[PDB]
């Protein structure tokens, strides 16, 4: 069943709808919510319930036609249907899509010097300062290899990143910018716009007064990136559910009529406000923010953003803004290169183990001397 698209509906009118019929190789190529162009013919279909045949009988403010032998003393009526012969939207895949130009570009990128900074500049050209944040958020896109232990338990792949800052400054820009760049990503907030919110919920379906699930933001963001704004202010119901979703990458439900396990495999980038709006530069992050220790311990990286009214900096920011309004690598190069890079699965070397265990031991004894 299809409906008039938002562009066609004449003002004040109710939408019209039509029944479309698909056959053979075209079947199950369109899902509810999709917008597509169909090619075919308009046809007329009779009321089959009032015809009679040697094989099967008839079943039984307008009138139909009369006077056919097969119709007896009943009357026959028609309706309109559209028979569509075609429908279209309105590892090997990389080898198929990349021409020699794309291969040369990813090779040049692989051989590039200070590629890290070049990609930071290319992906975040509008941003000023704050290189550490740019390096951190850039690494999140490359993820980490997931592993399954022999007894069947599994080890987490995605990293999670958190940014805290004053409402006047940069933290919102990163979220909306990476969301505009990235494929298959979701933007939302702790003050969510639906009954489901950040994780699945149960609703009663009035077609049977039967209980069914409804997806939250972290279910839809499966196999993608999730951006959450104003994370310091969030519902308790979701906050408990997030404990499992952050590490186990799954959601579990057990209520009347519904019992299920749902996937939530996602990289989260969270943005939050400190208490009293401006960050107290004299105090730790843990004193400044609203989050509890169990949630806070989940993230792999943390960053702080806070303003001060330096005249030259303000003047430079203003000139940048007005100049932008007055007007190395493209985003598609970054996309193609990122999809190329994510096929590698590097191992750790034997010698790297000694450095890793040493650094962790150094960190642990430092913590013990003045938790990790």
């Amino acid at each position: 069943r299809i409906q008039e698209t938002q562009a066609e509906l004449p003002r004040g009118s109710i939408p019209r709808s039509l029944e479309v019929i698909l056959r053979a190789e075209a079947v199950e190529s369109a899902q509810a919510g999709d917008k597509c162009d169909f090619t075919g013919t308009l046809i007329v279909v009779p009321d089959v319930s009032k015809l009679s045949t040697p094989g099967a009988r008839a079943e039984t403010e307008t009138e139909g036609i009369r006077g056919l032998r097969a119709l007896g003393v009943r009357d026959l009526s028609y309706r309109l249907v559209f028979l569509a012969c075609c429908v279209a939207p309105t590892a090997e895949s990389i080898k198929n899509q990349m021409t020699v130009k794309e291969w040369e570009k990813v090779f040049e990128m692989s051989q590039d010097k200070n590629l890290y900074h070049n990609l930071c500049t290319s992906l975040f050209p509008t941003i000023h300062g704050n290189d550490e944040v740019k390096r951190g958020v850039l690494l999140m896109l490359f993820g980490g290899v997931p592993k399954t232990t022999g007894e069947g338990t599994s080890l987490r792949g995605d990293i999670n990143v958190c940014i805290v800052g004053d409402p006047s400054t940069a933290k919102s820009q990163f979220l909306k910018h990476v969301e505009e760049f990235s494929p298959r990503a979701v933007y939302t907030s702790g003050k969510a716009s639906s009954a489901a919110g950040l994780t699945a919920a149960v609703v009663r379906d009035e077609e049977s007064h039967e209980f069914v699930i409804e997806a939250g933001a972290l279910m839809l963001a499966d196999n993608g990136v999730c951006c959450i704004d104003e994370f310091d202010k969030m519902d308790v119901r979701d906050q408990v559910a997030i404990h499992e979703a952050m590490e186990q990458q799954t959601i579990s439900i057990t209520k009347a009529g519904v019992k299920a396990t749902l996937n939530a495999r996602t990289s989260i980038l969270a943005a939050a406000n400190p208490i009293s709006g401006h960050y107290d530069r004299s105090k730790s992050l843990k004193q400044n923010i609203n989050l509890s220790a169990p949630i806070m311990s989940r993230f792999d990286l943390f960053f702080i953003l806070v303003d001060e009214c330096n005249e030259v900096t303000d003047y430079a920011i203003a000139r940048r803004i007005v100049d932008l309004h007055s007007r190395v690598y493209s985003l598609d190069d970054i996309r193609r290169y990122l999809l190329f890079a994510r096929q590698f699965k590097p191992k750790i070397s034997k010698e790297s183990e000694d450095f890793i265990v040493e650094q962790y031991k150094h960190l642990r004894q430092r913590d013990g001397s003045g938790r990790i």
Binding site: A91, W103, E104, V106, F107, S110, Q343, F344, K345
Partner: protein, 39 residues
């Protein structure tokens, strides 16, 4: 030279069909066994 090397290491790191594959394998076994039985 080096572009093909990059492709090579990249690849190093990287209805009805099942019944047809099964038929192909079993038919190969049939052909072999009937040949051996025939001789």
């Amino acid at each position: 030279r080096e572009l093909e090397a990059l492709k090579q290491r990249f690849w190093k790191h990287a209805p009805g069909e099942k019944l047809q594959v099964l038929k192909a394998k079993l038919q190969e076994a049939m052909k072999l066994r009937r040949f051996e039985e025939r001789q």
